[PDB]
Enzyme design. Structure first.
Site, PDB file in Angstrom:
ATOM      1  CD  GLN A 194      -3.283   7.558   9.107  1.00 42.66           C
ATOM      2  OE1 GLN A 194      -4.181   8.221   8.581  1.00 42.66           O
ATOM      3  NE2 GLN A 194      -3.210   7.050  10.333  1.00 42.66           N
ATOM      4  N   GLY A 195       2.090   6.985   8.297  1.00 41.01           N
ATOM      5  CA  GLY A 195       3.469   7.531   8.195  1.00 41.01           C
ATOM      6  C   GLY A 195       4.482   6.462   8.625  1.00 41.01           C
TER       7      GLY A 195
ATOM      8  CB  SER B 263       2.393   2.914   6.170  1.00 39.96           C
ATOM      9  OG  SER B 263       1.160   3.072   6.801  1.00 39.96           O
ATOM     10  N   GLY B 264       4.666   0.517   6.181  1.00 41.85           N
ATOM     11  CA  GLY B 264       5.739  -0.083   5.451  1.00 41.85           C
ATOM     12  C   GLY B 264       6.955  -0.412   6.275  1.00 41.85           C
TER      13      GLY B 264
ATOM     14  CG  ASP C  66       0.076  -3.908   3.010  1.00 42.90           C
ATOM     15  OD1 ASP C  66       0.497  -3.400   1.957  1.00 42.90           O
ATOM     16  OD2 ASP C  66      -0.254  -3.192   3.998  1.00 42.90           O
TER      17      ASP C  66
ATOM     18  CD  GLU D 265      17.205  11.007   6.359  1.00 41.63           C
ATOM     19  OE1 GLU D 265      17.670  11.611   7.344  1.00 41.63           O
ATOM     20  OE2 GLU D 265      16.882  11.674   5.361  1.00 41.63           O
TER      21      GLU D 265
ATOM     22  CD  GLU E 175      21.595  12.694   6.453  1.00 41.93           C
ATOM     23  OE1 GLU E 175      22.803  12.841   6.324  1.00 41.93           O
ATOM     24  OE2 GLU E 175      20.973  13.360   7.311  1.00 41.93           O
TER      25      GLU E 175
ATOM     26  CG  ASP F  19      -1.314   1.173  17.188  1.00 42.30           C
ATOM     27  OD1 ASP F  19      -0.609   0.314  16.608  1.00 42.30           O
ATOM     28  OD2 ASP F  19      -2.511   1.369  16.881  1.00 42.30           O
ATOM     29  CB  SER F  20       2.799   1.482  14.147  1.00 37.88           C
ATOM     30  OG  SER F  20       1.804   0.560  13.748  1.00 37.88           O
TER      31      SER F  20
ATOM     32  CB  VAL G 149      18.642  18.501   9.988  1.00 39.21           C
ATOM     33  CG1 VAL G 149      20.132  18.812  10.041  1.00 39.21           C
ATOM     34  CG2 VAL G 149      17.815  19.668  10.532  1.00 39.21           C
TER      35      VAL G 149
ATOM     36  CG  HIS H 265      -0.592   0.530   2.424  1.00 43.67           C
ATOM     37  ND1 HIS H 265      -0.325  -0.388   3.404  1.00 43.67           N
ATOM     38  CD2 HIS H 265      -0.391   1.772   2.955  1.00 43.67           C
ATOM     39  CE1 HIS H 265       0.075   0.244   4.506  1.00 43.67           C
ATOM     40  NE2 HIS H 265       0.023   1.549   4.252  1.00 43.67           N
TER      41      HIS H 265
HETATM   42  N1  LIG Z   1      -3.027   1.856  14.101  1.00 39.17           N
HETATM   43  C1  LIG Z   1      -2.090   1.244  13.357  1.00 39.17           C
HETATM   44  N2  LIG Z   1      -1.125   0.421  13.821  1.00 39.17           N
HETATM   45  C2  LIG Z   1      -1.929   1.827  11.997  1.00 39.17           C
HETATM   46  C3  LIG Z   1      -0.769   1.688  11.227  1.00 39.17           C
HETATM   47  C4  LIG Z   1      -0.704   2.255   9.948  1.00 39.17           C
HETATM   48  C5  LIG Z   1      -1.775   2.999   9.423  1.00 39.17           C
HETATM   49  C6  LIG Z   1      -2.939   3.148  10.218  1.00 39.17           C
HETATM   50  C7  LIG Z   1      -4.109   3.955   9.689  1.00 39.17           C
HETATM   51  O1  LIG Z   1      -3.888   4.699   8.731  1.00 39.17           O
HETATM   52  N3  LIG Z   1      -5.362   3.836  10.340  1.00 39.17           N
HETATM   53  C8  LIG Z   1      -6.466   4.632   9.817  1.00 39.17           C
HETATM   54  C9  LIG Z   1      -7.888   4.008  10.047  1.00 39.17           C
HETATM   55  O2  LIG Z   1      -8.648   4.327  10.933  1.00 39.17           O
HETATM   56  N4  LIG Z   1      -8.257   3.110   9.021  1.00 39.17           N
HETATM   57  C10 LIG Z   1      -9.209   2.065   9.376  1.00 39.17           C
HETATM   58  C11 LIG Z   1      -9.416   0.903   8.414  1.00 39.17           C
HETATM   59  C12 LIG Z   1      -8.233   0.614   7.469  1.00 39.17           C
HETATM   60  C13 LIG Z   1      -8.849   0.001   6.187  1.00 39.17           C
HETATM   61  O3  LIG Z   1      -9.380   0.743   5.386  1.00 39.17           O
HETATM   62  C14 LIG Z   1      -8.753  -1.483   5.991  1.00 39.17           C
HETATM   63  C15 LIG Z   1      -9.004  -1.998   4.699  1.00 39.17           C
HETATM   64  C16 LIG Z   1      -8.920  -3.373   4.535  1.00 39.17           C
HETATM   65  C17 LIG Z   1      -8.604  -4.265   5.562  1.00 39.17           C
HETATM   66  C18 LIG Z   1      -8.349  -3.745   6.822  1.00 39.17           C
HETATM   67  C19 LIG Z   1      -8.427  -2.364   7.022  1.00 39.17           C
HETATM   68  C20 LIG Z   1      -7.650   1.941   6.889  1.00 39.17           C
HETATM   69  C21 LIG Z   1      -7.189   2.823   8.044  1.00 39.17           C
HETATM   70  C22 LIG Z   1      -6.510   6.032  10.427  1.00 39.17           C
HETATM   71  C23 LIG Z   1      -7.386   7.001   9.898  1.00 39.17           C
HETATM   72  C24 LIG Z   1      -7.396   8.271  10.500  1.00 39.17           C
HETATM   73  C25 LIG Z   1      -6.582   8.553  11.595  1.00 39.17           C
HETATM   74  C26 LIG Z   1      -5.716   7.581  12.120  1.00 39.17           C
HETATM   75  C27 LIG Z   1      -5.701   6.318  11.533  1.00 39.17           C
HETATM   76  C28 LIG Z   1      -3.030   2.561  11.489  1.00 39.17           C
HETATM   77 CA   LIG Z   2      18.786  13.645   7.996  1.00 46.17          CA
END
Ligand SMILES: N=C(N)c1cccc(C(=O)N[C@@H](C(=O)N2CCC(C(=O)c3ccccc3)CC2)c2ccccc2)c1
Ligand SMILES: [Ca+2]
Length: 223
Positions: free
Chosen positions: A174-175, A177-178, A84, A52, A62, A171-172, A57, A40
């Protein structure tokens, strides 16, 4: 990362940042020319930034190397996030030292309750947004598959595992990811998805890297 700590400069040397004019995802260096990340996170024109700490900076250490190839698993399904995983080939080999190093792939799957290290430059807040300059870390355990599936009914495949705190608070996000989930020195997970971030009873969900070792090795061998 929500509820973790400042790793310390280059203390997670396999950790890379994927950049498209801005940091958008993490990845894990697995040899001098290949990085593992989430499917994704795919996009054209990726620039991989290795060594990094502060991503805003130039501090020294790097290495910025364009992706020459970005290979999404062929059975990746964007609706479910099954499979994924993505492999990125670097245009030139990175130079490996103590600040830029590869992380070993698993020789077996990890078990529930094992403690792992998850890191990234993702959102540090569960409500609202705040993106850090320096790499953040979080220690978290792998949860049982039954608890994983009760938290996310019908959404957990055999290529996924949950890790974190049923909690709320750590938790982990957005950002991140990967990015890596490393357990006893092996890359066992890829930050993949979760409902919100750090919310009670909605732990992180990670790609199960031990199921893809043969695929990674054959894909690298052929490319
Ligand atoms: N917490 C983690 N560890 C983590 C890690 C890395 C990204 C995210 C992430 O971005 N969380 C979304 C969220 O609420 N959603 C829900 C369903 C998921 C989806 O659409 C889906 C599709 C198929 C199968 C399973 C889930 C897509 C993200 C989000 C939206 C707004 C604010 C914060 C977080 C979360
Ligand atoms: Ca740097």
């Amino acid at each position: 990362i929500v509820g973790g700590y400042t790793c310390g400069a280059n203390t997670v040397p396999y950790q890379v940042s994927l950049n498209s004019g801005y940091h958008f995802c993490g990845g894990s260096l697995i040899n001098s020319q290949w990085v593992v990340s989430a499917a994704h996170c795919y996009k054209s024109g990726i620039q991989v930034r290795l060594g990094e700490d502060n991503i805003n900076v130039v501090e020294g250490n790097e290495q910025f190397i364009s992706a020459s190839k970005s290979i999404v698993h062929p059975s990746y399904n964007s609706n479910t996030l099954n499979n994924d995983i993505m492999l990125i080939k670097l245009k030139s080999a990175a130079s490996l030292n103590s600040r830029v190093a590869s992380i070993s792939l698993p020789t077996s799957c990890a078990s529930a309750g094992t403690q792992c290290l998850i890191s990234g430059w993702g959102n540090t807040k569960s409500s609202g947004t705040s993106y850090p300059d320096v790499l953040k870390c979080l220690k978290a355990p792998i949860l049982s598959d039954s608890s994983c599936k009760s938290a996310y009914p019908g959404q957990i495949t055999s290529n996924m595992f949950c890790a974190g705190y049923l909690e709320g608070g750590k938790d982990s996000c957005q950002g991140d990811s990967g990015g890596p989930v490393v357990c006893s020195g092996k890359l066992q997970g890829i930050v993949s998805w979760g409902s919100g971030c750090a919310q009670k009873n909605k732990p992180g969900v990670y790609t199960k890297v031990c199921n893809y070792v043969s695929w990674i090795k054959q894909t690298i061998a052929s490319n």
